């Protein structure tokens, strides 16, 4: 029965030889799961990233949730390899880095950060009309091109839905980005990416999530109590902006708004051009 689920990833990765096609090889991260290097299409003259157990299950989904879910607002997978004892991914390269970095060392105006929304809201959008759901939104799995363009990525944790089974209760995410009812194991649907969205919009705010000075577990209790989180400052903020971080933080699911919904809210008809966030790329590069 296992693990011919090791076996399974085998069918999934291409046929040859990396180093033959991708030269230029250079290191540029490492987080725990696994470590991200760098390299060029001898062929297109492209650049690219390359990520190189326990539980390998989460690669699989990874790979075949991303194959099959091609988005401008995705990080784009390209090609897979495991002639080693490691696995040779391959996606599309951003130089800009993730969102952390900016909301963690910059401070954006309303005009970014609708910016911002938008584009995670076209993907969200997108994955969700393929009954995907990410689980794992939070600026951290953002990742930034050099010309502002937004993408997003990690898949590993993604839930794929069915008109079978359009709900699951499995506690997964980071808890700081968590919505209420996954936290609370009750049924839950992609709408939770919504969730996680209002609590990135806290990060492009504040600075970072709420209750992140708590342990993960108080976190967790904290979410699952107070509900819907606090601004520090409300009234720093326009109304309209308030709005939509109502109607993606709302506790009731049904009040609380979809992707289609939220991409037609007025907060994102003050949205800058994406151009607008290479200075905050500039900024977090700087300091770092
Ligand atoms: N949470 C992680 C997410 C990945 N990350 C990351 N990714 C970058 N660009 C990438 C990465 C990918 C492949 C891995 C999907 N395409 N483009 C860059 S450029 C400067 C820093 C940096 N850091 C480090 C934190």
Same mark, same amino acid.
């Given at each position: 029965? =296992?693990?011919?689920?090791?076996?399974?990833?085998?069918?999934?990765?291409?046929?040859?030889?990396?180093?033959?096609?991708?030269?230029?090889?250079?290191?540029?991260?490492?987080?725990?799961?696994?470590?991200?290097?760098?390299?060029? $299409?001898?062929?297109?003259?492209?650049?690219?990233?390359?990520?190189?157990?326990?539980?390998?299950?989460?690669?699989?989904?990874?790979?075949?949730?991303?194959?099959?879910?091609?988005?401008?607002?995705?990080?784009?997978?390209?090609?897979?390899?495991?002639?080693?004892?490691?696995?040779?991914?391959?996606?599309?390269?951003?130089?800009?880095?993730?969102?952390?970095?900016?909301?963690?060392?910059?401070?954006?105006?309303?005009?970014?950060?609708?910016?911002?929304?938008?584009?995670?809201?076209?993907?969200?959008?997108?994955?969700?009309?393929?009954?995907?759901?990410?689980?794992?939104?939070?600026?951290?799995?953002?990742?930034?091109?050099? =010309?502002?363009?937004?993408?997003?990525? =990690?898949?590993?944790?993604?839930?794929?839905?069915?008109?079978?089974?359009?709900?699951?209760?499995?506690?997964?995410?980071?808890?700081?980005?968590?919505?209420?009812?996954?936290?609370?194991?009750?049924?839950?649907?992609?709408?939770?990416?919504?969730?996680?969205?209002?609590?990135?919009?806290?990060?492009?705010?504040?600075?970072?999530?709420?209750?992140?000075?708590?342990?993960?577990?108080?976190?967790?209790?904290?979410?699952?109590?107070?509900?819907?989180?606090?601004?520090?400052?409300?009234?720093?903020?326009?109304?309209?902006?308030? $709005?939509?971080?109502?109607?993606?933080?709302?506790?009731?699911?049904?009040?609380?708004?979809?992707?289609?919904?939220?991409?037609?809210?007025?907060?994102?008809?003050?949205?800058?051009?994406?151009?607008?966030?290479?200075?905050?790329?500039?900024?977090?590069?700087?300091?770092?």
């Amino acid at each position: 029965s =296992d693990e011919e689920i090791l076996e399974k990833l085998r069918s999934i990765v291409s046929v040859g030889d990396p180093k033959k096609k991708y030269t230029r090889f250079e290191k540029i991260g490492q987080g725990a799961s696994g470590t991200v290097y760098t390299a060029m $299409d001898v062929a297109t003259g492209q650049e690219v990233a390359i990520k190189q157990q326990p539980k390998k299950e989460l690669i699989i989904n990874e790979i075949l949730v991303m194959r099959e879910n091609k988005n401008p607002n995705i990080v784009n997978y390209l090609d897979s390899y495991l002639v080693g004892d490691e696995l040779w991914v391959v996606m599309e390269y951003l130089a800009g880095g993730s969102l952390t970095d900016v909301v963690t060392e910059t401070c954006m105006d309303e005009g970014q950060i609708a910016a911002v929304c938008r584009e995670c809201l076209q993907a969200l959008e997108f994955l969700h009309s393929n009954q995907v759901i990410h689980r794992n939104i939070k600026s951290d799995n953002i990742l930034l091109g050099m =010309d502002g363009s937004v993408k997003l990525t =990690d898949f590993g944790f993604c839930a794929q839905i069915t008109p079978e089974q359009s709900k699951r209760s499995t506690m997964v995410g980071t808890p700081y980005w968590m919505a209420p009812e996954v936290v609370t194991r009750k049924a839950y649907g992609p709408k939770v990416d919504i969730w996680s969205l209002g609590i990135m919009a806290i990060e492009m705010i504040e600075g970072e999530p709420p209750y992140l000075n708590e342990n993960p577990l108080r976190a967790l209790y904290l979410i699952a109590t107070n509900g819907t989180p606090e601004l520090q400052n409300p009234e720093k903020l326009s109304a309209i902006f308030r $709005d939509f971080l109502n109607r993606c933080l709302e506790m009731d699911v049904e009040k609380r708004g979809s992707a289609k919904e939220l991409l037609q809210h007025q907060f994102l008809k003050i949205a800058k051009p994406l151009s607008s966030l290479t200075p905050l790329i500039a900024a977090a590069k700087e300091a770092t």
